[PDB]
CSV table of C-alpha atoms and ligand atoms in Angstrom, one decimal:
chain,number,residue,atom,x,y,z
A,38,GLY,CA,-6.6,51.0,217.2
A,39,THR,CA,-6.5,54.4,215.4
A,40,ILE,CA,-9.5,55.8,213.5
A,41,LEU,CA,-8.9,58.3,210.7
A,42,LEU,CA,-11.8,60.7,210.3
A,43,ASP,CA,-12.0,62.5,207.0
A,44,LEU,CA,-12.7,66.2,207.2
A,45,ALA,CA,-14.8,67.7,204.4
A,46,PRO,CA,-13.2,70.6,202.5
A,47,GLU,CA,-16.4,72.6,203.2
A,48,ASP,CA,-15.7,72.2,207.0
A,49,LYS,CA,-14.3,75.3,208.9
A,50,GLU,CA,-11.9,72.8,210.7
A,51,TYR,CA,-10.5,71.7,207.2
A,52,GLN,CA,-10.3,75.4,205.9
A,53,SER,CA,-8.5,76.4,209.2
A,54,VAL,CA,-5.9,73.5,208.9
A,55,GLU,CA,-5.1,74.1,205.2
A,56,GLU,CA,-5.1,77.9,205.7
A,57,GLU,CA,-2.4,77.4,208.4
A,58,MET,CA,-0.6,75.0,206.1
A,59,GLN,CA,-0.6,77.3,203.1
A,60,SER,CA,0.0,80.7,204.8
A,61,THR,CA,3.2,79.5,206.7
A,62,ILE,CA,5.3,78.6,203.6
A,63,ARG,CA,8.6,80.5,203.5
A,64,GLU,CA,12.0,80.4,201.6
A,65,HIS,CA,14.9,78.2,202.7
A,66,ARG,CA,18.7,78.8,202.3
A,67,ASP,CA,19.2,75.3,200.7
A,68,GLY,CA,17.2,76.6,197.6
A,69,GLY,CA,14.6,73.8,198.2
A,70,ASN,CA,17.2,71.0,198.0
A,71,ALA,CA,15.6,69.0,200.8
A,72,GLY,CA,11.8,69.8,200.4
A,73,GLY,CA,11.6,70.8,196.7
A,74,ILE,CA,10.8,74.0,194.8
A,75,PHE,CA,7.2,75.2,195.4
A,76,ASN,CA,5.1,78.3,196.3
A,77,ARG,CA,2.0,76.3,197.3
A,78,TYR,CA,0.7,72.8,198.1
A,79,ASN,CA,-2.1,70.7,196.6
A,80,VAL,CA,-4.1,69.3,199.7
A,81,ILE,CA,-5.5,65.9,198.7
A,82,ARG,CA,-7.2,65.3,202.1
A,83,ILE,CA,-7.0,66.1,205.9
A,84,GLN,CA,-7.9,63.5,208.5
A,85,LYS,CA,-8.5,63.6,212.3
A,86,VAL,CA,-6.5,60.9,214.2
A,87,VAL,CA,-8.3,59.2,217.0
A,88,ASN,CA,-6.6,56.7,219.4
A,89,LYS,CA,-8.0,56.2,222.9
A,90,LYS,CA,-4.6,55.1,224.4
A,91,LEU,CA,-2.5,57.9,222.8
A,92,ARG,CA,-5.1,60.6,224.1
A,93,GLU,CA,-4.7,58.9,227.5
A,94,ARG,CA,-0.9,59.3,227.6
A,95,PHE,CA,-1.2,63.0,226.3
A,96,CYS,CA,-4.0,64.1,228.7
A,97,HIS,CA,-2.2,62.5,231.6
A,98,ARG,CA,1.0,64.3,230.7
A,99,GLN,CA,-0.9,67.7,230.3
A,100,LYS,CA,-2.2,67.4,233.9
A,101,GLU,CA,1.4,66.8,235.1
A,102,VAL,CA,2.9,69.7,233.1
A,103,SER,CA,0.2,72.3,234.2
A,104,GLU,CA,0.7,71.4,238.0
A,105,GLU,CA,4.4,72.3,237.3
A,106,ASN,CA,3.5,75.5,235.4
A,107,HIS,CA,0.6,77.0,237.4
A,108,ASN,CA,-2.5,75.3,235.8
A,109,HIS,CA,-1.1,76.2,232.3
A,110,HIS,CA,-0.1,73.5,229.8
A,111,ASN,CA,0.9,76.1,227.1
A,112,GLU,CA,-0.4,73.9,224.2
A,113,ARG,CA,0.5,74.9,220.6
A,114,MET,CA,-0.5,73.6,217.2
A,115,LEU,CA,2.8,72.8,215.3
A,116,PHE,CA,3.8,71.0,212.1
A,117,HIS,CA,5.8,67.7,212.0
A,118,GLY,CA,7.4,66.1,209.0
A,119,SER,CA,8.8,62.6,209.4
A,120,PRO,CA,9.6,59.4,207.4
A,121,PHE,CA,7.9,57.6,210.5
A,122,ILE,CA,4.4,59.2,210.2
A,123,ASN,CA,2.6,55.8,210.0
A,124,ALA,CA,4.2,54.6,213.2
A,125,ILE,CA,3.4,58.0,215.0
A,126,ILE,CA,-0.4,57.7,214.2
A,127,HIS,CA,-0.4,54.2,215.6
A,128,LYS,CA,2.1,54.1,218.4
A,129,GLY,CA,2.6,57.8,219.1
A,130,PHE,CA,5.6,60.1,219.3
A,131,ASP,CA,8.7,58.4,220.8
A,132,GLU,CA,11.7,60.2,222.2
A,133,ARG,CA,13.7,56.9,221.6
A,134,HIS,CA,13.7,58.2,217.9
A,135,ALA,CA,14.9,61.8,218.8
A,136,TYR,CA,16.7,63.7,216.1
A,137,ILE,CA,20.4,63.2,217.3
A,138,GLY,CA,21.7,65.7,214.8
A,139,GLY,CA,19.4,68.5,215.8
A,140,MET,CA,20.6,72.1,216.6
A,141,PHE,CA,19.2,72.0,220.1
A,142,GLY,CA,20.2,68.3,220.7
A,143,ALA,CA,18.5,64.9,220.8
A,144,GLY,CA,14.7,65.8,221.0
A,145,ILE,CA,11.5,65.7,218.9
A,146,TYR,CA,11.3,68.7,216.5
A,147,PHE,CA,8.3,70.7,215.4
A,148,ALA,CA,8.0,73.7,213.1
A,149,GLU,CA,5.7,76.8,213.0
A,150,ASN,CA,6.1,76.7,209.2
A,151,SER,CA,4.8,73.8,207.1
A,152,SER,CA,7.7,74.5,204.6
A,153,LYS,CA,10.4,73.5,207.3
A,154,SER,CA,8.5,70.2,208.3
A,155,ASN,CA,8.2,69.4,204.5
A,156,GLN,CA,12.0,69.1,204.3
A,157,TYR,CA,11.8,66.0,206.6
A,158,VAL,CA,8.8,64.0,205.1
A,159,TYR,CA,11.6,61.8,203.5
A,160,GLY,CA,14.1,62.0,206.3
A,161,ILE,CA,17.1,64.2,207.2
A,162,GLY,CA,17.9,66.5,204.2
A,163,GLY,CA,15.0,65.1,202.1
A,164,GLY,CA,16.6,61.7,202.4
A,165,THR,CA,17.0,60.0,198.9
A,166,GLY,CA,13.7,61.7,197.9
A,167,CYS,CA,10.3,59.9,197.2
A,168,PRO,CA,10.4,56.1,197.3
A,169,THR,CA,9.3,55.7,193.7
A,170,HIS,CA,11.2,58.3,191.6
A,171,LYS,CA,14.0,59.0,194.2
A,172,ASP,CA,13.1,62.7,193.8
A,173,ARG,CA,13.3,65.2,196.6
A,174,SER,CA,11.2,67.6,194.6
A,175,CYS,CA,8.6,65.0,193.2
A,176,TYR,CA,5.3,66.6,192.2
A,177,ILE,CA,3.6,63.3,191.6
A,178,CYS,CA,3.9,61.3,194.9
A,179,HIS,CA,1.5,62.2,197.8
A,180,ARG,CA,3.4,63.4,200.8
A,181,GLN,CA,2.2,63.4,204.4
A,182,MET,CA,2.7,65.6,207.5
A,183,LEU,CA,1.1,66.1,210.9
A,184,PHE,CA,-0.5,69.1,212.5
A,185,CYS,CA,0.0,68.4,216.2
A,186,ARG,CA,-1.1,69.5,219.7
A,187,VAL,CA,2.1,70.1,221.5
A,188,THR,CA,2.2,70.6,225.3
A,189,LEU,CA,5.1,73.1,225.7
A,190,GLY,CA,4.5,74.0,229.4
A,191,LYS,CA,7.4,76.2,230.5
A,192,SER,CA,9.5,76.8,227.4
A,193,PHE,CA,13.2,77.5,227.6
A,194,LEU,CA,14.1,80.0,224.8
A,195,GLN,CA,17.5,79.1,223.4
A,196,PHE,CA,19.5,81.2,220.7
A,197,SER,CA,22.9,79.4,220.5
A,198,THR,CA,23.4,76.0,219.0
A,199,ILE,CA,23.6,74.2,222.4
A,200,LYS,CA,23.0,70.4,222.4
A,201,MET,CA,20.7,69.4,225.3
A,202,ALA,CA,19.6,65.8,226.1
A,203,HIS,CA,16.6,67.0,228.2
A,204,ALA,CA,14.9,70.3,228.9
A,205,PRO,CA,16.6,72.6,231.6
A,206,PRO,CA,15.4,72.4,235.2
A,207,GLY,CA,11.9,73.7,235.7
A,208,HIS,CA,11.2,73.7,231.9
A,209,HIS,CA,9.2,71.3,229.6
A,210,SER,CA,10.4,72.4,226.2
A,211,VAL,CA,13.1,74.2,224.2
A,212,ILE,CA,12.4,77.0,221.7
A,213,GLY,CA,15.4,77.7,219.4
A,214,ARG,CA,15.8,80.9,217.3
A,215,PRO,CA,18.8,82.3,215.2
A,221,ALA,CA,16.0,81.2,209.8
A,222,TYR,CA,12.7,80.0,211.6
A,223,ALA,CA,11.7,78.9,215.1
A,224,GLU,CA,12.2,75.2,216.1
A,225,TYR,CA,10.2,73.6,219.0
A,226,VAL,CA,11.9,70.7,220.8
A,227,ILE,CA,10.3,68.3,223.3
A,228,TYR,CA,11.9,65.4,225.1
A,229,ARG,CA,8.8,63.4,225.9
A,230,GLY,CA,6.7,61.7,223.3
A,231,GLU,CA,3.5,62.0,225.4
A,232,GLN,CA,3.9,65.9,225.1
A,233,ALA,CA,2.6,65.8,221.4
A,234,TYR,CA,-0.6,64.3,219.9
A,235,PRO,CA,-0.9,63.8,216.1
A,236,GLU,CA,-4.2,65.7,215.8
A,237,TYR,CA,-4.3,65.9,212.0
A,238,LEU,CA,-2.8,63.8,209.2
A,239,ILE,CA,-2.5,65.9,206.0
A,240,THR,CA,-2.1,64.2,202.5
A,241,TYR,CA,-0.8,66.7,200.0
A,242,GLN,CA,1.5,67.4,197.0
A,243,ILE,CA,4.0,70.2,196.5
A,244,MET,CA,3.2,72.2,193.4
A,245,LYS,CA,5.5,72.9,190.4
A,246,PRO,CA,5.1,76.6,189.8
A,247,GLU,CA,3.6,77.7,186.4
B,301,3DN,C1,14.9,70.0,212.7
B,301,3DN,C2,13.4,70.2,212.6
B,301,3DN,C3,12.9,71.4,212.8
B,301,3DN,C4,11.5,71.6,212.6
B,301,3DN,C5,10.7,70.6,212.2
B,301,3DN,C6,11.2,69.3,212.0
B,301,3DN,C7,10.4,68.2,211.6
B,301,3DN,O1,9.2,68.3,211.2
B,301,3DN,N1,11.0,66.9,211.7
B,301,3DN,C8,12.3,66.7,211.9
B,301,3DN,C9,12.8,65.3,211.9
B,301,3DN,C10,11.9,64.3,211.8
B,301,3DN,C11,12.3,63.0,211.7
B,301,3DN,C12,13.7,62.7,211.5
B,301,3DN,C13,14.1,61.3,211.2
B,301,3DN,N2,14.7,60.5,212.2
B,301,3DN,C14,15.8,61.2,212.9
B,301,3DN,C15,16.4,60.4,214.1
B,301,3DN,C16,17.0,59.1,213.5
B,301,3DN,N3,18.1,58.4,214.4
B,301,3DN,C17,17.8,58.2,215.8
B,301,3DN,C18,18.5,57.1,213.8
B,301,3DN,C19,15.9,58.3,212.8
B,301,3DN,C20,15.3,59.2,211.7
B,301,3DN,C21,14.6,63.7,211.6
B,301,3DN,C22,14.1,65.0,211.8
B,301,3DN,C23,13.1,67.8,212.2
B,301,3DN,C24,12.6,69.1,212.2
B,302,ZN,ZN1,7.8,60.5,193.1
């Protein structure tokens, strides 16, 4: 069982999570075709995810990664947008659902920028938009994304669009660069869905 703990907007933990969410919005070449047209979000609530078994898989895998990377797990807080968010908070990240069409191959993707993860809340290319109004730029429906603990360990920095089924020897993750940085992991137990964020994209005035 998963427990969702509501963080209060007065909490420094909440202020930190939203600040990171708001401050990392940037412009995309698709002119917001996938995620929608916005300059800001409207944060409805932020919740801490608590699952005893998913923390066991994650903490077990950190120990393994640090032994292979000189007592350093190189953990980063990264965004994740998925049409599978409900299955992640209950059963965890699963590499059997890796993004086949990814630039850096069949792995699990994470963004530094909330704007990039927002383009995947409804699927690849914004899917067919929100389930109610079939709108990729819907300002009514409450969207969701995760702010995750990601054990990167030894990252392999990639620049070319080279499809990899697994990380290169000695490495635990792949960082791809050219408009923004993409973080790829090949093991589901290398991310923990720390925060579940419920928000809306805002129609500019
Ligand atoms: C590219 C990228 C960069 C940075 C951040 C992100 C991010 O937040 N999410 C994703 C993302 C998430 C979920 C899905 C949907 N899956 C794909 C696999 C699929 N197959 C096996 C049938 C089933 C639906 C596709 C992409 C990509 C991404
Ligand atoms: Zn809608």
